[PDB]
Amino acid sequence: QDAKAGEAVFKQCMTCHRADKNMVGPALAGVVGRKAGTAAGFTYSPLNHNSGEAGLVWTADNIVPYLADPNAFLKKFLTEKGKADQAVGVTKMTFKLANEQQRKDVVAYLATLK
Ligand code: HEC
Ligand SMILES: [N]
């Protein structure tokens, strides 16, 4: 949860994301503490959208595991809500970051965007 170390990790994330505009992925400023799937202007996959509508909020403790396996995390979330029938299919332009500390750190960095 070292935000400054997270800035470096975020350079990897900038392959697809920016803070303040949509790109391959949605803009991330304000993502921490927000309902999943609700960055203005971005067209989410059914899986990323459906998870937010089922009550997924991007708290730090949700973003950190998500970043290791977006499809698995989202499906697990929906399945535990008894909504496995909304979890069919996969996310867009899927990226996985295995390193746990890098995930923790970049999530602290995301909180600095707003
Ligand atoms: C392109 C290959 C990506 C890289 C590298 C990273 N992300 Fe990403 N992210 C990408 C897309 C296309 C999407 C939307 C997927 C969909 O199916 O709609 C996302 C989504 C996120 C989210 C969820 C945002 C929301 O508003 O619900 C988060 C929190 C996120 N991405 C963060 C993130 C970070 C911190 C990354 C670097 C470690 C990163 N992503 C890389 C595409 C890509
Ligand atoms: N992502």
- Residue 101 CA to ligand 1 center (angstroms) comes to 18
In this structure, are residues 11 and 42 in contact, taking their beta carbons and an 8 Å threshold? no
Candidate of 13, 14, 17 to mutate for ligand 1, largest count of ligand atoms within 8 Å of Cβ: 17
Resolution value in angstroms: 1.4
Technique behind this structure? X-ray
Q: How far apart are CA 95 and CA 30, in angstroms?
A: 20
Its CATH architecture, for the domain 2-114, is Orthogonal Bundle (1.10)
CA atoms within 13 A on the CB side of 11: 4
Residue 109's alpha-carbon distances to 3, 51, 87, in angstroms, are 4, 23, 29
One-letter identity of residue 65? P
CA distance 67 to 69: 6
SS3 57: strand
Please give the full DSSP string across 16-39, using - where no structure is assigned.
T--SSS-SSS---TT-TTSBTT-S
**Cα 79 from Cα 60, distance rounded (Å):** 20
Tokens of 92: 């867009």
74, 62, 64, 75: which is closest to 99 by C-alpha?
64
The DSSP line for 74-101 is HHHHHHHTT-GGG--S--SS------HH
Whole-number Å distance, alpha carbon 95 to ligand 1 midpoint, is: 7
89 token code pair: 């299919």
Query: What residues does each domain of the chain span?
Result: 2-114
